Amino acid sequence: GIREKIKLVSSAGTGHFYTTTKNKRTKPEKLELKKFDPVVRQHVIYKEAKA
Amino acid sequence: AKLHDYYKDEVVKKLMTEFNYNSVMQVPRVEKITLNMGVGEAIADKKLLDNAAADLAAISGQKPLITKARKSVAGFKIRQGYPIGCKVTLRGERMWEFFERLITIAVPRIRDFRGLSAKSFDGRGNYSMGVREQIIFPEIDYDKVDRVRGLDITITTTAKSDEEGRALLAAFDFPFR
Amino acid sequence: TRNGRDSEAKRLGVKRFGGESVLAGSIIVRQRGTKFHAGANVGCGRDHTLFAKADGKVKFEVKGPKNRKFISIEAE
Amino acid sequence: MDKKSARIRRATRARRKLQELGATRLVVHRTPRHIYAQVIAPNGSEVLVAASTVEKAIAEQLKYTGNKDAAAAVGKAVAERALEKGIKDVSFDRSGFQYHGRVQALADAAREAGLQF
Amino acid sequence: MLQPKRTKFRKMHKGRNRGLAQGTDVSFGSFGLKAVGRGRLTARQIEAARRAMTRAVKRQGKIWIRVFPDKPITEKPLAVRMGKGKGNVEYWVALIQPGKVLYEMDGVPEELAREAFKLAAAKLPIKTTFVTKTVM
Amino acid sequence: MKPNIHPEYRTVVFHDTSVDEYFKIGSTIKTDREIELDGVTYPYVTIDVSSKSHPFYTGKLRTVASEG
RNA sequence: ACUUACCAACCCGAUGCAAACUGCGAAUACCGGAGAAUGUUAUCACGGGAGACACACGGCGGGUGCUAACGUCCGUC
RNA sequence: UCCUCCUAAAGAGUAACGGAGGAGCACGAAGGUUGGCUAAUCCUGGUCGGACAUCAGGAGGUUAGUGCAAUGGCAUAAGCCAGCUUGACUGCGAGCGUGACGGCGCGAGCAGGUGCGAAAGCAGGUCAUAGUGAUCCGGUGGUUCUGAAUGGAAGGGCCAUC
RNA sequence: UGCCUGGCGGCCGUAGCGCGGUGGUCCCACCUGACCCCAUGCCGAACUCAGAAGUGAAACGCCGUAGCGCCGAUGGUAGUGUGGGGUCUCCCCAUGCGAGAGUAGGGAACUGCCAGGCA
């Protein structure tokens, strides 16, 4: 409900992604969060993208 | 600091012999002086508050805390958390230097001054008073004032009664009736 | 305007009573708030379910200055 | 909230958490003039070892009883006393004081001397 | 005419009316009118009876009403199917159990209160009896 | 008292008028110095309004009548 | 700004009322441990075959209805 | 369709075109952790200020507050700030609860890697309970799978997701 | 061994509030000072540090004291399991369980480990 689904993508080469939502209006910039990439088995920066 | 001494060097003595207290720790003490400016209309002009704080800042000598509305209430059309005033709590050296500047060179610059009330005590020894014009303080540069503005003073005390509370202030020859 | 609605019963309540012997993990109470609080060898989950952290016998007690209800598990 | 009742309130949570864990706690108490330490058993009602600046054996060697240097001596003492009684692993109960002045000097000293926490 | 000024809920389950009365002594006046049957007093009944006892004494002395109709009663009208929702509140009753002191009175002679309580008694749907204040 | 956010605060000296009892005080005001290295500023102080200064008024405040 | 036969929430003492009130609170019910007698295993599992899913009056506890109905909807016997 | 209270007979469950209400969202902080804090309401005093803003004292004691309905909870706060943050982790999971089933839920503990803390320790979202849509078909990315003579490819499976 | 204090607990109002009295060698508290450690959406108030001039005023502890809270029978009353009955919306009998409120009355906690001070 106005809250859009986005995917956070692994900054390593893997194509691993977490999925979440965003109020794309009030918080229009790209969400960037450290999370665990299970393919390299290490925590890596993840950066917002479209779904 | 001079007036802290007059408290120690001179006031205690006066009060002990006045009320015949058994322990010197019963003698009323000035605990703190809290300055407040009820702004009320920054809700319309966000900038009216900034100039009030800086008025207090030069008056008190420390950065004021700006007080938010504890509670939204539509009577004054204010939403909770709206900045609606600013305050300063003075203690120690700074409180005493203010206490002096107040009597020695502000109250005299009140327009047609004739003395302060002696009945503005809250009933448990604390005295509160208003000023209409912050221009009585010489830290205020009459040319720069954006606007004349007033001010709450409360002297919180450790007297249990007003009779005791008044003697403490009286003992500084605090101007009354 | 108009009534006629309700929701499913959540089948809450005490699941093992005083004395019942349980293996660790067994839910002892389903509750909304903490009517019973977790005591020794008892865990509290996010919906305030109290569960066993050890094999033993269920023990209800009342403890403390607020007279709160506590569940613990005694080894048997 | 009145200094004392406020500190105790600040302390209650960590102690219940500690009770649940069954830790033997190294409990510190601070006062402007003195500092005190008790190693207390998990039941909460029997003290296994103790040291403080209130015992003459300790204060004799101290400039002023209420400062950081003295607290460091108390820390060193409980640690030693506890190890002679076979005690090694404990948990620290700062008891509502900040972990910081004197209190932090005392812990460091118990740690300097082999007490495990 | 008595009625709750406001209530938490509009309507109330029918419920039942077993039990003995509470508030069984003349606790305000000198004399009382006491319930012997179980049942319902309507707000209008309390009134028909209140007027009469007050007529009867020529508005002398003092009167207390110990009951209050806080129970909403509904009814379904003519030409209505069962169901389709609970009836509408039409009137209010107080539930009466044997022993309830209904009215008290004082400031008048024993003889006159009895006449007055007798006159009201004719307005009520439950048997009553005449009582007096008692030490202990 | 919190580093790096307050208003200077010096020990200023205050000069009065037809009376030679300056005072020195905290205050934040700005002026220009002298004796042992302070401030200055000529007002009309406590020992001046005629309910502090008790009587003697005259001065350059105001009057109450002339003659008679 | 003073005052009135007026009307007055709060608070105090006195008295009722509550399914969606509780600073109290049973009888029964239910869950669990042990134990004997008794009981054609009455219990449990899997497996073959089903039927049945219009219910009725009475009793107790109730909602609804008028504490109306050979009324109507639940629980229990 | 879903949540909360009552009916509901002191375990669970329990009907009605019975009685009240509410959801189909929200939040990168309003999540995590460490440290810290304690409401509402009245009286008295106080510039402009008023029945009610901000300041002070006393009384009070949670009647406040909780992103929102109700109930249940909450001071050790779950209520209010601040700093550092990404555990709003990936793989699993003893043992339970609840369901005709499909499913739903609670869950210590193990592995890997992580945040906060001196530390004991906490964290697998939010005080809990609503905030939702099976299958098919199909889109997108990944892939030691499969690849109709053979090597590829297309299609398919597998993981993620729309 | 005793009285006093402090710290950690058991119990969780018979344990609390009040009202009165009371103690400072030690403890404890207010306290003194603060550049600094460290802190204040401002304030050395609180946090915190260095201290020991003063005080038991506040607070705290102890003693008392029934104004409250709190506790609380006996008897009776309510209800209710089974069986039976009536004038069956409610009631009664036998038997078992047996409240709540209220009354008498209790009540100014009791207690463990450790440590210090006096005797």
Ligand SMILES: [Mg+2]
């Ligand atoms: Mg079968």
Ligand SMILES: [Mg+2]
């Ligand atoms: Mg059918």
Ligand SMILES: [Mg+2]
């Ligand atoms: Mg059927």
Ligand SMILES: [Mg+2]
């Ligand atoms: Mg049927």
Ligand SMILES: [Mg+2]
């Ligand atoms: Mg029928």
Ligand SMILES: [Mg+2]
């Ligand atoms: Mg039930």
Ligand SMILES: [Mg+2]
């Ligand atoms: Mg039941």
Ligand SMILES: [Mg+2]
């Ligand atoms: Mg905390």
Ligand SMILES: [Mg+2]
């Ligand atoms: Mg006011």
Ligand SMILES: [Mg+2]
């Ligand atoms: Mg670390």
Ligand SMILES: [Mg+2]
């Ligand atoms: Mg929250």
Ligand SMILES: [Mg+2]
């Ligand atoms: Mg081919």
Ligand SMILES: [Mg+2]
């Ligand atoms: Mg091929």
Ligand SMILES: [Mg+2]
């Ligand atoms: Mg201090």
Ligand SMILES: [Mg+2]
């Ligand atoms: Mg005292």
Ligand SMILES: [Mg+2]
């Ligand atoms: Mg009783």
